Design a protein around this ligand. Structure first.
Ligand code: C0L
Lengths: 49, 1111, 17
């Protein structure tokens, strides 16, 4: 127990994958060196561009 | 009409509704005032009976008083929950961040039962928050919104799931009370009783009856036709009351010695001692009403009665008997039938004051269980309730409720519309409410009782559909948490004119046809065979004698936002809901023009919207200003009205208020005086009115791709204001006190230019991302310098300045002037949090032009991103040289089922054009029943249509036939709504006429800059080694499971390895690669991952022999 | 009569730990 109505976490719970009885989404580390944005058409552009 | 500043918008009302719009905010006002118990509410509830007007607080007093020791030697009591005035004005409370509240005084009294002496005090219960006049609350200056949560009430709940394995209906009941225990009267597979109770696993009814003081004689007497009853009483296999009592006691406390007095002294406490087993008063009401038991008396005594249980059993057995209705002795016959958890008749509504009282009860519980604690430990004949009182837990609960609650949420003020929409919101998830996955999909469904009560259209389209909606417009609330709905009762083939606020249950009793009915001008009707809603929610041609209630009006099943899309009955609910939820995402432009076309909603919406200042008293104007207006009340008295100008919303949008009148003017009470942001001429305004064609042009309008002329840009027609606030504190470290100043560590001078004299920058200065905001500094401590740095200092004569440079710089992608500086200082006696001494907050605005990529959408769900900002000249345009505004793609129209936008476009062209229908040879037939003075139209006059009462296409065609020329002899559009156009690029006319017209559109709160973001290298983790995610900081994009497995599919491995090593975990390798890039050299090899080794150590420390073998 | 299945289960939840 502690304060804050909320359970505990052994070493067993620090397991990254730790899939028990269900194969949830995976959700690893969110790498680097990208950029996001909304997308738009390039109708003037070539295919490879 | 019926509005003073109502700008003349003609509409197409073919009907006439008796009642007008209600007070949309009453949903919150009334709950709040009742919880208050204000005399407003006092007369209010008194208007419809309500012999005992009791406030929720009064209820809490009566449910708490008296307060007495278990010995019963001494007695405490309360009285007069009395509010004190608020400690500060709402504006001041918001600005200085003091939560707008007010004290609480109670006439509490203690008396010693031993001898009897009054201890009356008027106790400060605590400062108590006060609702806004916009029905909201300000916490610490912050502005939240409470939500009303849907819950099916506690009640006697019936069902017979047929055991198909037995092929037998299994009638059952679960009477779930508040603060109580459960119980089942089950139709077992055998001809027996499912008398499992309080989660016990099983009982015979006979055990209850003899336990209830009933002989088998008494039972068969009371239950002669009771077949399973007689069977079980033959199989009761136990005789005598106390035998049943002891069996119950042992099976209830198994692992416990049975005692005889616990026979009555447990069950009566379990189910009749109304101190630990108490469904709500509304629960008792539902009980009697379902059962007609307490027919003519007010509700009380949440404890049960054997009367209740026996009527229960009788109805249950008869339901599993073949029955229609049974009148209990003392009760009218209730129709024998099941129950529904989904149907509103069980699904009540915990209101705001409801939840507040719940918190009050839970706090006062703890407080009384400590008062009774001290009640003995307190010294006798020397205490006072002041000595007895602790308001700390109660105030704690209050605070932790206003803050720290998914029902106490931030008012999304992006515009008056969505502000309103946030209120009047309906959700069943929450504390007590079901969580997300625990609810079955069926609760998301649209039960036919929903009709006219909860608009089936408006709801979040994410993974919460069906979980949250809003109210129908003309809906109204039961004091018991139900939907009391007005209805037009018809009598004798003649609709009366008496509005009838009805719930859903009684509705099932009755017969309601449709408002769109051929009424014979008098309540009399036209045809016999009439549509009508069935008690099963079904429709037929009733012969026109049978109905007793007609619809109050059309659109009684619409939401607010849903009430604001013309032609709505022509397009699919899908794009409908899409545009609906989007329309709350509108963004207030700076010009705020009103649409040519609309509904009747656009004015009432604002007049409840509030943010548009309303004329309080009728009067002549005194003097105006850009910031306020002096108002001459008609007799002497006067007043000002402080315009809110450039007030930062909860989303960076401006909140100006411009006045709309003159100081020599004279207006009337309840009248518009100054539009708010999205308000134009008093009514709503969420965009502009634009002429568009629909061709596929150059592919640039490909798959929702949306093109734009430069003309709007250079005309500022799409122009947003944004208000980003920055704040930083003056803490104090072990190294000393944080410092703010122009004095800096190593830094340029020009970078120290636009600061003030004492750190912070100067008002009105332009800025750009990374620039310095505030010159702040703290000591860093002491470490041995590098010999190199020491050398640079030596050659350069440069001091140490161990105080570290900790200033405020603007984050990325930000610019615009700084309007106002908000500064706080502990030295100034500014109250600040501990470990702080000075606070400053900054306000920058940037007049964002419209730009490509941003998301626009009409009022149809028809939406999309900005394809490309094209110049004006290179544009398809009229024969009058008038360029088009934008172009949409036809191909999205059919498959989306959104012809209403086409309707709107034709209508808007007609509206801009103006007509004058030649009623020279009588009237053209389509115009026959059409309202007069539509026979012409001044160009660019404003009009509107009721949702279900809109113009017909034939009407529109007859209009479009009448399309008087603009300036010259100029019928620019055919009778088919198309026209010939010219490519500003080609030079030629296009081969065909083209659909065109004026459409009103919005701008969404999803600007490009809000989303655009990239990154190479930034601040690495603390737990892991990893440079921070989150676009608030840099952040970036997570390359996880989908395109890994993918890259493997491609077969390319090295890129994946590089990503997962040198962009993921290799501490040394990261700087290595950075070096290699800086030097222009071949990449180093990917080192070992870090989380790998971390997991390795973990597995080790799990007491696990672990090891790799290289060979 | 067949309701006793909880009896085997109810015994093990309680004295548990
Ligand atoms: C030392 C290993 C002991 C046994 C493994 C245990 C206990 C783990 O519990 C399961 C393996 C695992 C998950 C560890 C996660 C770690 C070390 C970590 O922090 C991550 C992470 O969370 C995600 C990733 C990648 C992005 C996962 C990509 C998977 C691709 N799979 C595939 O290519 O399909 C064939 O790497 C990590 O090092």
């Amino acid at each position: 127990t502690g304060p804050g109505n909320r359970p505990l976490k052994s070493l067993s719970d620090l397991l990254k994958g730790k899939q028990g009885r269900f194969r949830q989404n995976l959700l690893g580390k969110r790498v680097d060196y990208s950029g996001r944005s909304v997308i738009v058409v390039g109708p003037q552009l070539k295919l490879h561009q | 009409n019926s509005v003073p500043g109502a700008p003349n918008r003609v509409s197409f009302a073919k009907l006439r509704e008796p009642l007008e719009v209600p007070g949309l905010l009453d949903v919150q006002t009334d709950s709040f005032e009742w919880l208050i118990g204000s005399p407003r509410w006092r007369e209010s509830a008194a208007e419809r009976g309500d012999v005992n007007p009791v406030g929720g607080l009064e209820e809490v007093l009566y449910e708490l008083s008296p307060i007495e020791d278990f010995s019963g030697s001494m007695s405490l009591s309360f009285s007069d929950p009395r509010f004190d005035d608020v400690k500060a004005p709402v504006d001041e409370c918001k600005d200085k961040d003091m939560t707008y509240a007010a004290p609480l005084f109670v006439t509490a009294e203690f008396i010693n039962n031993n001898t009897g002496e009054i201890k009356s005090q008027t106790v400060f219960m605590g400062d108590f928050p006060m609702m806004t006049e916009k029905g909201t609350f300000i916490i610490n200056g912050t502005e939240r919104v409470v939500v009303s949560q849907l819950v099916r009430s506690p009640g006697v709940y019936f069902d017979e799931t047929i055991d198909k394995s037995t092929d037998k209906t299994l009638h059952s009941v679960k009477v779930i009370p508040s603060r109580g225990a459960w119980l089942e009267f089950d139709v077992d597979k055998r001809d027996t009783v499912g008398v499992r109770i309080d989660r016990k696993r099983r009982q015979p009814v006979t055990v209850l009856l003899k336990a209830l003081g009933w002989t088998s004689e008494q039972i068969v007497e009371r239950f002669g036709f009771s077949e399973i009853m007689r069977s079980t009483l033959e199989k009761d296999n136990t005789v005598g009351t106390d035998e049943a009592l002891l069996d119950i006691y042992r099976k209830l406390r198994p692992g416990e010695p049975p005692t005889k007095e616990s026979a009555q002294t447990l069950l009566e406490n379990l189910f009749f001692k109304e101190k630990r087993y108490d469904l709500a008063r509304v629960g008792r009401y539902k009980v009697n009403k379902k059962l007609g038991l307490h027919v003519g008396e007010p509700i009380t005594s949440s404890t049960l009665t054997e009367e209740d249980v026996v009527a229960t059993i009788e109805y249950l057995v008869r339901l599993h008997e073949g029955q229609t209705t049974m009148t209990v002795p003392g009760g009218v016959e209730v129709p024998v039938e099941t129950d529904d958890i989904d149907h509103f008749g069980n699904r009540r509504l915990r209101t705001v004051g409801e939840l507040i009282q719940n918190q009050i009860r839970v706090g006062m519980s703890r407080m009384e269980r400590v008062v009774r604690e001290r009640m003995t430990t307190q010294d006798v004949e020397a205490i006072t309730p002041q000595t007895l009182i602790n308001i700390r837990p109660v105030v704690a609960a209050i605070k932790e409720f206003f803050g720290t609650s998914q029902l106490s949420q931030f008012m999304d003020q992006n515009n008056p519309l969505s502000g309103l929409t946030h209120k009047r919101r309906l959700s069943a998830l929450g504390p007590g409410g079901l969580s997300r996955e625990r609810a079955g999909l069926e609760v998301r469904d649209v039960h036919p009782s929903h009709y006219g009560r909860m608009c089936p259209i408006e709801t979040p389209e994410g993974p919460n559909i069906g979980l949250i909606g809003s109210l129908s417009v003309y809906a109204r609330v039961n004091p018991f948490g139900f939907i009391e709905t007005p209805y037009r009762k018809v009598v004798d083939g003649v609709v009366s004119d008496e509005i009838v606020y009805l719930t859903a249950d009684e509705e099932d009793r009755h017969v309601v046809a449709q408002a769109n009915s051929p009424i014979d001008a008098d309540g009399r009707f036209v045809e016999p065979r009439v549509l009508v809603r069935r008690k099963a929610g079904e429709v037929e041609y009733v012969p026109s004698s049978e109905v007793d209630y007609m619809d109050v009006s059309p659109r009684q099943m619409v939401s607010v936002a849903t009430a604001m899309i013309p032609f709505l009955e022509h397009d699919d609910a899908n794009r409908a809901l899409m545009g609906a939820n989007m329309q709350r995402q509108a963004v207030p432009l700076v010009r705020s023009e009103a649409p040519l076309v609309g509904t009747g909603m656009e004015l009432r919406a604002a007049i409840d919207a509030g943010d548009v200042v309303v004329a309080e008293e009728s009067g002549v104007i005194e003097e105006v200003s850009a910031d306020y207006i002096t108002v001459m009340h008609d007799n002497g008295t006067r007043r000002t009205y402080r315009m809110r100008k450039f007030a930062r919303s909860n989303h960076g949008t401006c909140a100006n208020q411009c006045p709309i009148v003159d100081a020599g003017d004279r207006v009337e009470a309840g009248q518009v005086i100054a539009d708010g942001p999205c308000t134009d001429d008093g009514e709503m305004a969420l965009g502009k009115n634009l002429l568009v064609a629909i061709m596929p042009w150059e592919g640039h309008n490909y798959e929702d791709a949306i093109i734009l002329s430069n003309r709007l840009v250079e005309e500022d027609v799409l122009t947003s204001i944004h208000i980003e606030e920055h704040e930083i504190d003056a803490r104090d470290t072990k190294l000393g006190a944080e410092e703010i100043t122009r004095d800096i560590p190593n830094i340029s001078d020009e970078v120290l230019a636009d600061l003030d004299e004492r750190g912070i920058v100067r008002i009105g200065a332009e800025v750009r991302d990374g620039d310095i905001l505030v010159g702040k500094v703290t000591p860093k401590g002491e470490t041995e310098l590098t010999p190199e740095e020491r050398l640079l200092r030596a050659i350069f004569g440069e001091k140490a300045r161990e105080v570290r440079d900790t200033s405020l710089k603007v984050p990325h992608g930000e610019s615009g002037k700084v309007i106002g500086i908000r500064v706080f200082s502990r030295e100034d006696e500014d109250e600040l949090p501990a470990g702080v001494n000075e606070l400053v907050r900054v306000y920058v605005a940037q007049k964002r032009k419209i730009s490509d990529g941003d998301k626009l959408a009409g009022r149809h769900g028809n939406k999309g991103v900005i394809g490309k900002i094209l110049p004006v000249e290179d544009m398809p345009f009229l024969a009058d040289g008038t360029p088009v505004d934008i172009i949409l793609n036809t191909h999205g129209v059919p498959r989306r089922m959104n012809i209403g936008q086409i309707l709107e476009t034709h209508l808007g062209w007609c509206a801009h054009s103006g007509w004058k229908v030649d009623a020279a040879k009588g009237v053209p037939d389509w115009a026959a029943r059409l309202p007069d003075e539509l026979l012409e139209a001044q160009p660019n006059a404003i009009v509107s249509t009721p949702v279900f009462d809109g113009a017909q296409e034939a009407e529109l065609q007859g209009l479009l036939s009448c399309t008087l020329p603009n300036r010259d002899g100029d019928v620019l559009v055919d009778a088919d709504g198309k026209a010939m156009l010219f490519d500003g690029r080609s030079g030629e006319p296009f081969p065909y006429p083209v659909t065109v017209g004026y459409m009103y559109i919005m701008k969404l709160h999803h600007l490009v800059d809000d989303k655009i973001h990239a990154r190479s290298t930034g601040p690495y983790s603390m737990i892991t080694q990893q440079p921070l995610g989150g676009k608030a900081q840099f952040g970036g994009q997570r390359f996880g499971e989908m395109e890994c497995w993918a890259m493997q599919a491609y077969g390319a491995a090295y890129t994946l390895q590089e990503l997962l090593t040198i962009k993921s975990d290799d501490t040394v390798g990261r700087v290595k690669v950075y070096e290699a890039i800086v030097k222009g050299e071949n990449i180093p090899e990917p080192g070992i991952p870090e989380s790998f080794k971390v997991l390795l150590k973990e597995l080790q420390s799990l007491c696990l022999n672990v090891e790799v073998l290289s060979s | 009569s067949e309701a006793l299945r909880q009896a085997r289960k109810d015994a093990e939840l309680t004295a548990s730990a």
